[PDB]
């Protein structure tokens with residue numbers, strides 16, 4: 001789809017209609033400890049001053065960290081939802097791509113924590129996100 | 141378009157083409173110490189599991205806090221960009237609207253800080269965002 | 281003690297020997313939704329440049345938010361521990377007192393969230409802390 | 421005293437009288453991109469439930485990241501103070517040492533950002549702190 005982990009036969013919202021598909025997020029790699037994703041910059045990713053929207057970096061980090069957790073825990077009967085997202089912005093991006101790498105740093109019974117680095121086409125660190133993902137028994 | 145502050149005669153990217161116009165953010169009240177905005181929930185705002193995307197709350201807080209700062213500082217020769225966005229998620233929203241209220245709590249010379257509450261249609265506090273906005277002289 | 285909630289007959293560490301008692305934190309008010317505490321500035325609260333240590337504000341917020349949660353949940357068989365502490369620093373404090381007010385904004389089954397405001401003797405907002413407190417069944 | 425960088429001929433407050441000297445923080449390595457420090461756990465570091473206080477991890481990260489910045493910028497006429505400290509807690513520490521490693525990830529002209537890991541004696545990641553340090557010209 002955007003290559004999200006295939007863990008269920010039906011999803012409530014089709015990729016192309018979600019925020020993820022609308023702005024164009026695509027997952028490249030995914031393992032239990034490390035996942036990567038990326039997006040082309042288009043105006044849909046921008047704010048009116050022409051820079052990538054701060055919310056775009058937050059949303060990229062959120063889907064990558066959450067879905068990399070879903071990829072492990074869904075078959076174990078658990079759901080995984082974002083609980084906290086702290087993104088800090090170091091350098092703006094005006095065009096090209098934004099590439100995210102999520103590295104898992106803690107995997108607890110109720111919380112997984114991911115460090116996400118957001119880089120521009122020159123490899124420069126433009127933002128980071130500390131993602132905290134709540135993991136709970138799936139409700140009937 | 142989304143009732144963002146009119147502080148310039150032209151902008152790099154038109155409202156309807158930005159992330160904010162694409163998902164449908166609209167500013168209601170705007171003062172130097174407080175601002176509100178809301179968005180109707182549609183699939184464009186959701187992730188594939190059918191909930192409002194964590195990134196959408198981050199983005200709504202981000203735009204509102206930044207533009208509320210812009211409204212004040214632009215005519216003083218400053219720009220205002222997000223430097224830190226920490227959003228915590230308390231309850232999911234499945235449909236209706238998300239309504240954001242931003243309250244200014246510190247206005248320094250280099251950093252303004254806003255507390256943003258994001259509520260659902262029943263008035264419940266579903267997410268909060270602590271927004272730090274860097275204020276710097278405009279380069280042109 | 282520092283007037284911490286009296287919820288158990290024995291505690292592993294006496295007040296006066298903990299970090300709290302060593303720097304002098306004292307709780308003034310406590311209810312399920314709102315708690316206050318304060319400390320005299322002494323060198324023990326300072327760093328070597330003579331300002332209150334950033335860690336002092338974090339530690340004040342942490343004990344106040346956590347113990348205001350303990351005050352409700354301990355008798356229900358639960359423990360409460362800090363899970364995240366985000367403190368932002370707006371104005372330094374060189375002497376006098378630091379006064380903290382914690383307002384509960386969410387009380388979930390597994391997480392309570394407290395906004396803490398840290399004010400100087402003139403009432404000025406010097407720092408804030410967003411405290412996330414994990415609440416778990418007490419282990420035998 | 422705690423092996424903090426020697427960048428001035430005198431300081432307002434002596435090491436042994438500061439928070440850092442009182443709880444016993446000691447800097448081991450210090451470079452412009454990386455620094456380490458450690459502390460022996462004693463009751464002075466703990467809270468009443470017998471665990472290292474959340475505030476102590478915050479303070480150790482705070483001092484290390486700030487002073488690591490100080491080591492570089494002081495001789496350039498700048499001061500460096502904590503602007504934001506976000507510490508997340510993964511595992512409690514009851515005794516032994518806490519060992520902090522600070523890695524610089526962004527060095528802007530107004531803000532330096534450090535990732536701090538806090539590990540226990542077995543090497544386990546017990547807490548992390550994202551430290552944003554404001555760099556500003558010294559007023560004298």
Ligand SMILES: CC(C)(COP(=O)(O)OP(=O)(O)OC[C@H]1O[C@@H](n2cnc3c(N)ncnc32)[C@H](O)[C@@H]1OP(=O)(O)O)[C@@H](O)C(=O)NCCC(=O)NCCSCC(=O)c1ccc(O)cc1
Nearest residue numbers: 108109110111343346362416419467473474509510511512
């Ligand atoms: C926050 C949380 C409970 C969340 O759990 P998680 O992310 O699902 O991690 P998980 O549940 O897999 O457990 C990790 C470790 O946490 C501990 N833990 C987790 N749940 C429990 C529990 N129900 N009972 C006892 N220990 C637990 C235990 O050490 C566990 O390891 P293990 O024995 O299971 O191998 C766990 O990450 C944690 O315990 N983190 C540390 C909390 C901490 O140390 N905070 C700072 C101290 S408490 C706050 C404070 O400063 C304070 C100061 C003054 C004052 O008067 C009161 C409070």
Ligand SMILES: CC(C)(COP(=O)(O)OP(=O)(O)OC[C@H]1O[C@@H](n2cnc3c(N)ncnc32)[C@H](O)[C@@H]1OP(=O)(O)O)[C@@H](O)C(=O)NCCC(=O)NCCSCC(=O)c1ccc(O)cc1
Nearest residue numbers: 248249250251327333334369370371372483486502554556
């Ligand atoms: C971070 C910042 C500098 C950013 O400024 P801002 O948000 O734009 O606010 P603004 O610049 O308008 O100034 C607000 C107040 O900050 C102070 N300030 C700002 N710039 C300066 C400066 N260049 N020189 C001295 N003070 C300044 C000043 O008190 C100012 O009030 P005023 O005298 O200008 O009315 C300001 O918010 C601030 O100073 N916050 C407090 C920082 C703080 O106290 N952090 C904790 C202590 S430092 C870190 C630490 O714990 C540590 C521990 C051990 C150790 O060995 C080393 C460090």
Ligand SMILES: CC(C)(COP(=O)(O)OP(=O)(O)OC[C@H]1O[C@@H](n2cnc3c(N)ncnc32)[C@H](O)[C@@H]1OP(=O)(O)O)[C@@H](O)C(=O)NCCC(=O)NCCSCC(=O)c1ccc(O)cc1
Nearest residue numbers: 063066082136139187193194229230231232388389390391
């Ligand atoms: C995070 C947490 C589960 C923690 O729970 P808590 O602080 O203990 O709160 P509590 O458990 O009392 O429940 C509050 C509400 O959360 C929901 N909830 C809590 N636990 C569960 C559960 N096990 N199953 C279903 N719903 C639950 C439920 O709505 C609950 O209300 P109620 O039905 O019990 O009245 C709860 O606060 C929460 O659900 N918060 C919202 C999480 C959220 O909406 N995050 C953003 C969306 S998920 C992340 C994301 O953006 C994403 C994007 C793309 C993608 O592909 C994947 C993910």
Ligand SMILES: CC(C)(COP(=O)(O)OP(=O)(O)OC[C@H]1O[C@@H](n2cnc3c(N)ncnc32)[C@H](O)[C@@H]1OP(=O)(O)O)[C@@H](O)C(=O)NCCC(=O)NCCSCC(=O)c1ccc(O)cc1
Nearest residue numbers: 047053054089090091092203206222274276528529530531
């Ligand atoms: C926040 C800050 C200005 C602080 O500076 P710093 O950490 O000291 O780094 P420094 O000042 O060294 O500059 C780093 C880069 O930032 C940019 N920058 C810094 N100061 C300026 C300035 N005065 N004017 C223009 N660009 C600047 C510049 O690109 C710089 O690289 P260089 O050209 O100087 O090599 C810089 O880190 C930065 O720009 N970060 C990125 C900010 C960002 O992109 N936030 C997200 C977008 S803005 C918020 C938003 O989403 C929004 C959405 C809707 C809406 O309607 C309004 C806003």
